[PDB]
């Protein structure tokens, strides 16, 4: 439930490799890549204190709330821990609404898949 | 672990979705199709599953499995480099393990 974050970097062969970590008690997320990088990966979980799930950007703080917002809203709806990896170029806010609506449609049609 | 994917025509793109359902957790991936497939999770030896569709590239499934072995927990690996040379991958794995030894409370 309690999230901690870490990052580190290393020169391996002739390239800078960048690592991000998210630690929960029973789960670990390891991300390997380059720096700089996009910060489009989030996790949210239902707090038992508030009705609003706490959403964290796993790849470093960002002011873009697309992934954190989606994760939070889906965690609210499903009552489980939700990771979102949002890999779309098009960050028009209306496009994101279309995407979110499509996800909700799938959840209505196939609740057992979520 | 249960996997699902779907696509939708939204404006002038296919938007592509991948879903992984565990009992406690859900992973949603949004992007384009076709796409890279280098995201895995391992849990219990630990068994590794590719979240983004079957692949012959074992970089992330291999890494996840090895780190899940070492840590005894569920481990996701997202491998975002082009270089999938197995010697390079071992260097990557070793660097992670060094960090785990130095800062065990961060893992
Ligand atoms: Cl470099
Ligand atoms: Cl089609
Ligand atoms: Cl293949
Ligand atoms: Ni970073
Ligand atoms: Ni796919």
From Swiss-Prot, chain A:
Domain of life: Eukaryota
Cellular component GO terms, alphabetical: cytosol; protein-containing complex
Keywords: Chaperone
Name of a matching Pfam family: PAC4
GO BP, one annotated term: proteasome assembly
GO molecular function annotation: protein-containing complex binding
InterPro entries, sorted: PAC4
Family indicated by similarity: Belongs to the PSMG4 family.
Quaternary assembly: Interacts with PSMG3. Associates with alpha subunits of the 20S proteasome.
Main function: Chaperone protein which promotes assembly of the 20S proteasome.
Name of this chain's protein: Proteasome assembly chaperone 4
Annotated organism of origin: Homo sapiens (Human)
